[PDB]
């Protein structure tokens, strides 16, 4: 039951300079680290974290390194600066996962009511969202096997807590607050149309590749169940929304009546004092 | 920068606004204001307020540090 957290990009910038560590310490490609924070609510804030000296064998991928010199006494420092900012979880880069991740979660679930794994992004080019949470889940099956523990897609976000823009919005040095209706809407048009419908192309990768080579999660328990939600309105020729067209007279009713009367008021706005200050500036020049 | 000026006017305002009182006005947009701290000041006052609203020793809003009539 986690919708969102508040993300301070401060220790994300510590993921940036530990991303500067891994480029110069050697073979370690992926930036893996441990996420500090405090559960207040379903909404949460992350104010600090720390990035672990970690190694991972490509053969038998479940080989973790979370040193307890690096854990315990640094938790004594991080406890010593603040009793509040303790652990909440951990992180690593890459989009999908790591054969070790689940075990790495269970090393610190002894420390936290819900150790969250938030898989992070060092090079953002994404079509969807930034870093996103994964809570402790036991969904198993309708089967009755031993308990599944792989941590499922529990929504998060990049929240912004407090002032902090004496630095940040001074470091903007480019951007403008658009009074929406000034192209920002078409930016959202490109990102939801394009970045939504290429995700639809990922969904034809799903519903074509799963038809092609997809095993058991081809139709596990959510495909037809959200083919219902797909069956909101997928219909054939033009989908025939006959209620929605005089319902649309009730819609465009409002917008054209407001634009008609109100933009005639805008005709007073522009036209009248445009003429007055116009011809004052014109013939009062002489 | 027009919007920066507009939003700039109220950054340092409205959260922790102290209350003093008007006393006198020497000139344009700079005047004398007594305070509920006990002392008197001669500070630069805004172009925001209508200039005829400062006849009495009215309850006025000031900054802690800057002490500006807003």
């Amino acid at each position: 039951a986690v919708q969102k957290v508040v993300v301070h990009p401060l220790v994300l910038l510590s993921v940036v300079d530990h991303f500067n560590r891994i480029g110069k310490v050697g073979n370690q490609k992926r930036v893996v680290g441990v996420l500090l924070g405090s559960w207040q609510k379903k909404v949460l804030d992350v104010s600090n974290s720390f990035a672990v000296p970690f190694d991972e064998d490509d053969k038998d991928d479940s080989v973790w390194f979370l040193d307890h010199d690096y854990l315990e006494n640094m938790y004594g420092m991080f406890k010593k600066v603040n009793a509040r900012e303790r652990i909440v979880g951990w992180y690593h880069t890459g989009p999908k996962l790591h054969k070790n991740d689940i075990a790495i979660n269970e090393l610190m679930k002894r420390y936290c009511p819900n150790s969250v794994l938030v898989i992070i992004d060092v090079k953002p080019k994404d079509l969807g969202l930034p870093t996103e949470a994964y809570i402790s889940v036991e969904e198993v099956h309708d089967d009755g096997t031993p308990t599944s523990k792989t941590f499922e897609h529990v929504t998060s976000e990049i929240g912004a807590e407090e002032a902090e823009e004496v630095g940040v919005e001074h470091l903007l040095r480019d951007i403008k607050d658009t009074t929406v209706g000034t192209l920002s809407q078409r930016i959202t048009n490109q990102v939801h149309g394009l970045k939504g419908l290429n995700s639809k192309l990922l969904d034809i990768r799903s519903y074509l590749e799963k038809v092609a080579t997809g095993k058991l999660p081809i139709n596990h328990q959510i495909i037809y169940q959200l083919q219902d939600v797909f069956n909101l309105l997928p219909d054939v020729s033009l989908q025939e929304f006959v209620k929605a067209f005089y319902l649309k007279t009730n819609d465009q009713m409002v917008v054209v009546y407001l634009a008609s009367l109100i933009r005639s008021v805008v005709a007073l706005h522009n036209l009248i004092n445009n003429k007055i200050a116009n011809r004052d500036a014109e013939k009062k020049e002489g | 920068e027009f919007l920066h000026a507009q939003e700039e006017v109220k950054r340092i305002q409205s959260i922790p606004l102290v209350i003093g009182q008007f006393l006198e006005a020497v000139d344009q947009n700079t005047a004398i204001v007594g305070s509920t701290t006990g002392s008197n000041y001669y500070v630069r006052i805004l172009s925001t307020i209508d200039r005829e609203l400062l006849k009495p020793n009215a309850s006025v809003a000031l900054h802690k540090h800057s002490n500006a009539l807003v």
Partner: protein, 278 residues
């Protein structure tokens, strides 16, 4: 043996730990140590501002924990980079961010060991975006009054550091103090991703969220009729016949453009049915 205009290539995380160190750093003033790299003579860089324990006793030279120094640098050794300290930070979040009377002692107490050890004064409680109160000072001394106190070698950096020169007791403290120049680093290795998470985050996230609409307009249309009668009192106020009026009291705007972009939003909002559906 020579004086040069310096420079501070700042790690953005430094100012991040200062805004956390003064934002959460409750305005009872505190103290820390600055961890950068003495790169050369004519510049210096900071790469780290670390955190201090709850020294809620007093800003002092004695507040430094050396086993936290050694174990801190040790934890930089078990992480990738064991860099070098370059000085010290402190926080003045309460008052007008000027050099306290411990700074006038602990500065030369620290730079006795160091080379420069530039002070760091901060107050995030000044503003939210408009005022960036970062502050830094190099303690000149009465030993170096033999030479004049003019490095000057590259100018207009301390000419534009000279451009404010307005802090009350610091203007006064022109004796014993000359500040250092602080630019912000070309941080596009992070300003890129702060940009991409900045606008990939702060406008409807996945952006299939807004694409509320019309009862806002209902309330907004009652706004946008309810101000219209007092907006149209101004042509009555333009009926001065010959001339009797100073500055027109122009209330022409603030109700043009609200209707403009608001009903751009209402008409593309009218599009979103035939945009979302097909």
């Amino acid at each position: 043996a020579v004086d040069t205009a310096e420079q501070v290539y700042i790690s953005s995380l430094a100012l991040l730990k200062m805004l956390k160190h003064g934002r959460a750093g409750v305005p009872m003033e505190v103290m820390g140590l600055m961890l950068g790299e003495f790169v050369d003579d004519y510049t210096v860089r900071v790469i780290d501002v670390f955190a201090m324990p709850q020294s809620g006793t007093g800003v002092s030279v004695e507040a430094v924990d050396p086993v936290f120094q050694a174990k801190m640098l040790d934890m930089l050794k078990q992480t990738g980079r064991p860099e070098m300290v370059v000085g010290w930070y402190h926080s003045h979040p309460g008052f007008g961010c000027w050099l306290s009377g411990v700074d006038i002692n602990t500065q030369q107490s620290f730079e006795a060991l160091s080379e420069r050890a530039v002070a760091v004064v901060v107050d995030p409680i000044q503003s939210v975006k408009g005022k960036v109160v970062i502050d830094a000072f190099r303690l000149i001394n009465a030993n170096m009054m033999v030479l004049g106190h003019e490095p000057r070698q590259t100018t207009s950096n301390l000419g534009h550091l000279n451009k404010p020169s307005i802090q009350a007791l610091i203007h006064g403290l022109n004796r014993h103090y000359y500040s250092i120049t602080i630019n912000y680093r070309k941080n596009e290795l992070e300003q890129k991703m702060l940009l991409n998470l900045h606008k990939k985050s702060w406008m409807e996230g996945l952006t299939l969220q807004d694409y509320v609409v019309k009862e806002m307009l209902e309330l907004a249309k009652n706004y946008n009729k309810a101000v219209e009668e007092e907006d149209k009192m101004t042509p009555e106020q333009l009926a001065i016949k010959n001339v009797g009026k100073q500055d027109p009291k122009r209330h022409l705007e603030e109700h043009v453009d609200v209707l403009m972009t608001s009903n751009i939003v209402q008409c593309l909002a009218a599009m979103l049915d035939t945009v979302v559906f097909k």
